[PDB]
Design a binder for this molecule. Sequence first.
Ligand SMILES: NC(=O)c1ccc[n+]([C@@H]2O[C@H](COP(=O)([O-])OP(=O)(O)OC[C@H]3O[C@@H](n4cnc5c(N)ncnc54)[C@H](OP(=O)(O)O)[C@@H]3O)[C@@H](O)[C@H]2O)c1
Ligand SMILES: NC(=O)c1ccc[n+]([C@@H]2O[C@H](COP(=O)([O-])OP(=O)(O)OC[C@H]3O[C@@H](n4cnc5c(N)ncnc54)[C@H](OP(=O)(O)O)[C@@H]3O)[C@@H](O)[C@H]2O)c1
Lengths: 364, 364
Amino acid sequence: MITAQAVLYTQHGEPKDVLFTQSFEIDDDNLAPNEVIVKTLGSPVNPSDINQIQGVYPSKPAKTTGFGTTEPAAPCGNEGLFEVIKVGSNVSSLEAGDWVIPSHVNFGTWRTHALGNDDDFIKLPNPAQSKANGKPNGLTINQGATISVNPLTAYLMLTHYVKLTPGKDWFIQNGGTSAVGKYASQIGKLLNFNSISVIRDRPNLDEVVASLKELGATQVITEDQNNSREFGPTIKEWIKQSGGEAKLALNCVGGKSSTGIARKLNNNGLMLTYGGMSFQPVTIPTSLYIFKNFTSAGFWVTELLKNNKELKTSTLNQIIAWYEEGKLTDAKSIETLYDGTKPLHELYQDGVANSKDGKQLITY
Amino acid sequence: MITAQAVLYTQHGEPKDVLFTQSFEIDDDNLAPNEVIVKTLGSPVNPSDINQIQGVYPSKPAKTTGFGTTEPAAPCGNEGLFEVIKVGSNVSSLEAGDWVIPSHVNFGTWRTHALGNDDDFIKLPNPAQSKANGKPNGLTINQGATISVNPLTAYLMLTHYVKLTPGKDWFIQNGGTSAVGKYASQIGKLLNFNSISVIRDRPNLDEVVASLKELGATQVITEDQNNSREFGPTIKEWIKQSGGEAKLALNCVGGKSSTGIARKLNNNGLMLTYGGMSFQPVTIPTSLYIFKNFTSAGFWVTELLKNNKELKTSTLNQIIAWYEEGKLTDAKSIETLYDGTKPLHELYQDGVANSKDGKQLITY
Ligand SMILES: NC(=O)c1ccc[n+]([C@@H]2O[C@H](COP(=O)([O-])OP(=O)(O)OC[C@H]3O[C@@H](n4cnc5c(N)ncnc54)[C@H](OP(=O)(O)O)[C@@H]3O)[C@@H](O)[C@H]2O)c1
Ligand SMILES: NC(=O)c1ccc[n+]([C@@H]2O[C@H](COP(=O)([O-])OP(=O)(O)OC[C@H]3O[C@@H](n4cnc5c(N)ncnc54)[C@H](OP(=O)(O)O)[C@@H]3O)[C@@H](O)[C@H]2O)c1
């Protein structure tokens, strides 16, 4: 008989307002033949998780009484890393000790345990298994807990929409310091795509520029350079010299930033909007559409991979392989350990409030 | 020897400031074997013509001294209807009396005459020729003079990008009172597309609404209604109750208007931006891209048809056929006749100044 904790809400709103923690019990002695019990190792706070609770994200778990509430309640969090604790009599694809992520969104990963069927999960190698398998590296908890959204998002935006000629063509991305952006820089490096990362200026600009170039940005500019008519020819020359074109823009900021990166594409450019961190709309001069044949589209990993297990699997497999080979590193998280002294929902509330500090991971 | 008149400018700027009339001589007796002389029958004042004169349009005729000026000067106007006055010895694609339009932009149509080669012109049937061909109608001067831009633009936007299901699907367009808008409404009716036209409010709204519905708009709303969150569900009902979807948005306004019509599309909607009458940029909420898989693109008839003679021909032929069959009517022009007493440039300056009154056509 396991006592678990889950972060719930019964009504949408700001996480600081509507979240609470619900204790509930899992009976490890009553597993159906295809059922599995998992224990959470870590799960991040993503913007989508927050948007989901706020009610402005049209993919969400049902509100149910399943965690022992009287009011229907929804769990929180869409990705995370779990460890298999026990499996039913008919489960052969998972065993105790295995690492898994949810196979689908809306599973609720802001909680200590879960009961599910074996097909609710996708197996990741644990570090012991990686090492036994002759890999130079095993996954860290943060790498496994964050493998399913941001790395896939970067990979798919860079490969699924426009073919960049290796060693020649460019993508331009804003939110250069974001977790997605750091994955995008690395994957650009691994696939030999040139890239410009746009970041907000900061006192240690030089340090951050150096870090992003190491990850794999070709050039790094500030949003002020992004805004600059004067600086524009600098960017054109970079591209001219490469013999390639700027064919793809990645936008998770909106507002002026989206305008700026759109302007820097060659004619017949494509922008994918995948976030709006500024809360400002995507703003594009009429002339880009008419005269430069700019196209502005969206990207939603959840929808793309909704009914494409094949694409999810091969992408996820590539990310796993890169980690095991040491070719990819994670967007690092600020980690907060749950030990039962402070209610679980307060840790996540803190993670939401502190997300400005950088990606937050709640660990167990 | 023919004495002609051309509207020119030596320096870019507002038409009211920079235009003048230049007399020039055309020799009707010494034509090269491929050369053609034409007499202008009518030419309209279009936004792009003004933008060229203003120097804010990326495609413009070269400044030249060929009209007999000291300073180099450019001609004005991109479309018009001409009558063939005389052809060279090797010309067999055109005869005297034939009706033609320019085959390419930047021809300079704000003038009485032109000398060019036969391939500078595209033949339309004159009313004699339509009659002899058994059509119930021949083209009018305004229909010929304005056939080459706005109706091709409306047709191509409606048919070249997304397939609307006849009798079911919708497009939504702003600038509903524009010439292009009025063509689109009719072409929508002819192809059995449902549509919403968004227009600016005005004293005679009821009359304008009736007029556009007569042309073919299924529904007409004001920009206020376009902006209204409360009115939104009413528009969604129109589309849902028809059994179709709103798949296409046509934008020539920009700004809040572009936002509003984008919001009315179903998932996987496409917006085509073909103008920016508000001078505000195309503004799209991030959520439409991510969650509605909205796409925003451009339309420039000049670029699209620039190397697609077959598509241009097919479209032009259909527009001609509908006029001939009496199935399509022109967006009406306010016509100013040049009798040679008032300087030609003054007629066009007036046309420009009065273009807010509606499409202006100078006739000869
Ligand atoms: N569509 C999808 O499928 C999908 C999937 C995953 C993620 N996303 C989106 O990707 C974006 C980043 O996600 P993440 O997980 O990588 O988050 P993250 O690690 O927390 O990074 C947040 C980023 O936003 C920047 N930022 C914050 N406020 C800003 C502002 N007002 N103007 C400009 N930049 C601002 C931050 O830059 P600073 O360092 O300067 O503060 C940082 O780069 C989010 O919009 C998220 O919703 C979308
Ligand atoms: N990209 C291409 O290939 C292409 C081809 C043809 C035309 N166009 C563009 O299509 C547009 C219409 O051209 P047209 O020849 O049809 O001109 P038009 O007949 O003169 O129509 C002008 C339209 O603009 C509206 N308008 C004017 N000022 C406005 C403002 N501040 N806000 C909102 N609406 C405003 C007018 O509405 P009101 O009645 O209320 O005044 C009217 O609907 C222009 O932008 C033109 O440049 C583009």
